[PDB]
Enzyme design. Structure first.
Site, mmCIF file in Angstrom:
data_model
loop_
_atom_site.group_PDB
_atom_site.id
_atom_site.type_symbol
_atom_site.label_atom_id
_atom_site.label_comp_id
_atom_site.label_asym_id
_atom_site.label_seq_id
_atom_site.Cartn_x
_atom_site.Cartn_y
_atom_site.Cartn_z
ATOM 1 N N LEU A 105 0.827 -1.221 0.000
ATOM 2 C CA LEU A 105 0.000 0.000 0.000
ATOM 3 C C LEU A 105 0.849 1.254 0.000
ATOM 4 O O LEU A 105 0.464 2.272 -0.560
ATOM 5 C CB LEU A 105 -0.975 0.025 1.188
ATOM 6 C CG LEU A 105 -2.066 -1.049 1.195
ATOM 7 C CD1 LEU A 105 -2.722 -1.162 2.569
ATOM 8 C CD2 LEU A 105 -3.127 -0.745 0.118
ATOM 9 N N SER A 121 5.221 2.748 1.164
ATOM 10 C CA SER A 121 6.444 2.562 1.924
ATOM 11 C C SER A 121 7.240 3.847 2.017
ATOM 12 O O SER A 121 6.975 4.814 1.296
ATOM 13 C CB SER A 121 7.319 1.465 1.299
ATOM 14 O OG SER A 121 7.759 1.855 0.012
ATOM 15 N N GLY A 122 8.230 3.835 2.903
ATOM 16 C CA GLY A 122 9.186 4.921 3.029
ATOM 17 C C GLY A 122 10.378 4.414 3.814
ATOM 18 O O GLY A 122 10.582 3.195 3.932
ATOM 19 N N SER A 157 7.244 -0.353 5.563
ATOM 20 C CA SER A 157 6.335 -0.684 4.454
ATOM 21 C C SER A 157 5.004 -1.191 4.955
ATOM 22 O O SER A 157 4.945 -1.895 5.965
ATOM 23 C CB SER A 157 6.969 -1.780 3.576
ATOM 24 O OG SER A 157 8.188 -1.319 3.016
ATOM 25 N N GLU A 216 -6.472 -2.215 11.635
ATOM 26 C CA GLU A 216 -7.779 -2.246 11.006
ATOM 27 C C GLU A 216 -7.683 -1.749 9.563
ATOM 28 O O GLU A 216 -6.859 -0.872 9.247
ATOM 29 C CB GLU A 216 -8.753 -1.391 11.840
ATOM 30 C CG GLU A 216 -10.004 -0.916 11.118
ATOM 31 C CD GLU A 216 -10.813 0.110 11.924
ATOM 32 O OE1 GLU A 216 -10.314 0.601 12.987
ATOM 33 O OE2 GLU A 216 -11.956 0.409 11.475
ATOM 34 N N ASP A 257 -7.876 7.347 0.996
ATOM 35 C CA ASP A 257 -7.311 8.385 1.874
ATOM 36 C C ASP A 257 -7.783 9.751 1.409
ATOM 37 O O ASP A 257 -8.233 9.898 0.259
ATOM 38 C CB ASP A 257 -5.787 8.276 2.053
ATOM 39 C CG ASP A 257 -4.974 8.833 0.879
ATOM 40 O OD1 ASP A 257 -3.778 8.510 0.840
ATOM 41 O OD2 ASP A 257 -5.470 9.587 0.018
ATOM 42 N N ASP A 268 1.158 14.610 13.047
ATOM 43 C CA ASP A 268 1.275 14.565 11.565
ATOM 44 C C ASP A 268 -0.109 14.497 10.921
ATOM 45 O O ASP A 268 -0.353 13.704 9.994
ATOM 46 C CB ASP A 268 2.180 13.371 11.159
ATOM 47 C CG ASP A 268 2.642 13.420 9.671
ATOM 48 O OD1 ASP A 268 2.700 14.539 9.096
ATOM 49 O OD2 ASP A 268 2.936 12.319 9.100
HETATM 50 C C1 LIG Z 1 3.715 5.787 2.852
HETATM 51 O O1 LIG Z 1 2.555 4.966 3.124
HETATM 52 C C2 LIG Z 1 2.073 4.724 4.391
HETATM 53 C C3 LIG Z 1 2.811 5.159 5.499
HETATM 54 C C4 LIG Z 1 2.389 4.940 6.803
HETATM 55 C C5 LIG Z 1 1.187 4.289 6.966
HETATM 56 C C6 LIG Z 1 0.435 3.843 5.882
HETATM 57 C C7 LIG Z 1 0.851 4.054 4.563
HETATM 58 C C8 LIG Z 1 -0.005 3.585 3.379
HETATM 59 N N1 LIG Z 1 -0.878 4.658 2.821
HETATM 60 C C9 LIG Z 1 -0.089 5.737 2.203
HETATM 61 C C10 LIG Z 1 -0.997 6.809 1.570
HETATM 62 N N2 LIG Z 1 -2.064 7.225 2.486
HETATM 63 C C11 LIG Z 1 -2.775 6.175 3.186
HETATM 64 C C12 LIG Z 1 -1.792 5.205 3.835
HETATM 65 O O2 LIG Z 1 -0.767 3.194 6.262
HETATM 66 C C13 LIG Z 1 -0.826 3.173 7.624
HETATM 67 C C14 LIG Z 1 -1.916 2.576 8.416
HETATM 68 C C15 LIG Z 1 -3.156 1.891 7.982
HETATM 69 N N3 LIG Z 1 -3.933 1.322 8.920
HETATM 70 N N4 LIG Z 1 -5.022 0.782 8.226
HETATM 71 C C16 LIG Z 1 -4.902 0.995 6.895
HETATM 72 C C17 LIG Z 1 -5.725 0.649 5.831
HETATM 73 C C18 LIG Z 1 -5.354 1.027 4.539
HETATM 74 C C19 LIG Z 1 -4.172 1.741 4.310
HETATM 75 C C20 LIG Z 1 -3.350 2.089 5.371
HETATM 76 C C21 LIG Z 1 -3.733 1.696 6.645
HETATM 77 C C22 LIG Z 1 0.374 3.850 8.128
HETATM 78 O O3 LIG Z 1 0.617 4.005 9.388
#
Ligand SMILES: COc1ccc2c(c1CN1CCNCC1)O/C(=C\c1n[nH]c3ccccc13)C2=O
EC number: 2.7.11.1
Length: 264
Positions: free
Chosen positions: A8, A10-11, A15, A81, A88, A127
């Site tokens: 989904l 990474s950085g 990931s 979850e 997003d 953030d």
């Molecule tokens: C660079 O991408 C990152 C970085 C940190 C987190 C992350 C993601 C993935 N995506 C990046 C873009 N915006 C939505 C989250 O998803 C997280 C948590 C999630 N909890 N439940 C989810 C359900 C779908 C997607 C992400 C999450 C992070 O903490």
């Protein structure tokens, strides 16, 4: 124990993958956090993110819940979850442009309730921005994610910051110091501008320090006033969460399900 799906995001932190809990088919996200990129550790030794999520993952809310976590030699793995279908807020705004005020009001209200919940639980996100907000598209419910830059809430000054610069307040830009609540309210001002204008108001340090807000889209005077209040240059001039929620622009919010029916 988990079936791993597509990446989904990474950085440098690590990931995140889509996933399914094998036992009951529950949708999850699987977040791998690199040990050497964790700057702030907590104790129950774990990433601060796990401490924070446990503090707020108690009960229902507009915060993504931590379901389980695992430790590996070089990383932690977090099970979170995952609403389905989900988008997003960044992607949502990219697709739809500036949001109708009725919709921005519903979204912004839910973010405020989520942030209040964190603060009431002793947790500061640090953030808050469109990319860290998920929309449960069927229910019209917003969820805060990514406590990887967060901290325990305290009343004294913070001198560390690893959230998003363009959402960071002028006191951070200038003096590398801020207080928790007033910095959060600044980021909320950036967020609300973003919702109603379709982009953030400031790109460079100099614009943040100047704090002059130019509206690039038609926005009601009441909304402009709330935004400008949240973006007051002096931290103590910014509204409290209570003052935000009592603002005339915030009145008569739609329910999340009505928001879904009308706008999603
Ligand atoms: C660079 O991408 C990152 C970085 C940190 C987190 C992350 C993601 C993935 N995506 C990046 C873009 N915006 C939505 C989250 O998803 C997280 C948590 C999630 N909890 N439940 C989810 C359900 C779908 C997607 C992400 C999450 C992070 O903490």
């Amino acid at each position: 124990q988990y079936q791993v799906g597509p990446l989904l995001g990474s950085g440098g932190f690590g990931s995140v993958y889509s996933g399914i809990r094998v036992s009951d088919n529950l949708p999850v996200a699987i977040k791998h956090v690199e040990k050497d990129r964790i700057s702030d550790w907590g104790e129950l030794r774990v990433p601060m993110e796990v401490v924070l999520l446990k503090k707020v993952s108690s009960g229902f809310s507009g915060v993504i819940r931590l379901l389980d976590w695992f430790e590996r030699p070089d990383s932690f793995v977090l099970i979170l979850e995952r609403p389905e279908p989900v988008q997003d807020l960044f992607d949502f705004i990219t697709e739809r442009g500036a949001l109708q005020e009725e919709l921005a009001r519903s979204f912004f209200w839910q973010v405020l309730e989520a942030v209040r919940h964190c603060h009431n639980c002793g947790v500061l996100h640090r953030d808050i921005k469109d990319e860290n907000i998920l929309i449960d598209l069927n229910r019209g419910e917003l969820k805060l994610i990514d406590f990887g830059s967060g901290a325990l809430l305290k009343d004294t000054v913070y001198t560390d910051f690893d959230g998003t610069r363009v959402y960071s307040p002028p006191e951070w830009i200038r003096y590398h110091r801020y207080h928790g609540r007033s910095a959060a309210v600044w980021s909320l001002g950036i967020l609300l501008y973003d919702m109603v204008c379709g982009d953030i108001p400031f790109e460079h340090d100099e614009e943040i320090i100047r704090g002059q807000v130019f509206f690039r889209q038609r926005v009601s005077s009441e909304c402009q006033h709330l935004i400008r209040w949240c973006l007051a240059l002096r931290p103590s001039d910014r509204p409290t969460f209570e003052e935000i929620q009592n603002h005339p622009w915030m009145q008569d919010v739609l329910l999340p399900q009505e928001t879904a029916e009308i706008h999603l």
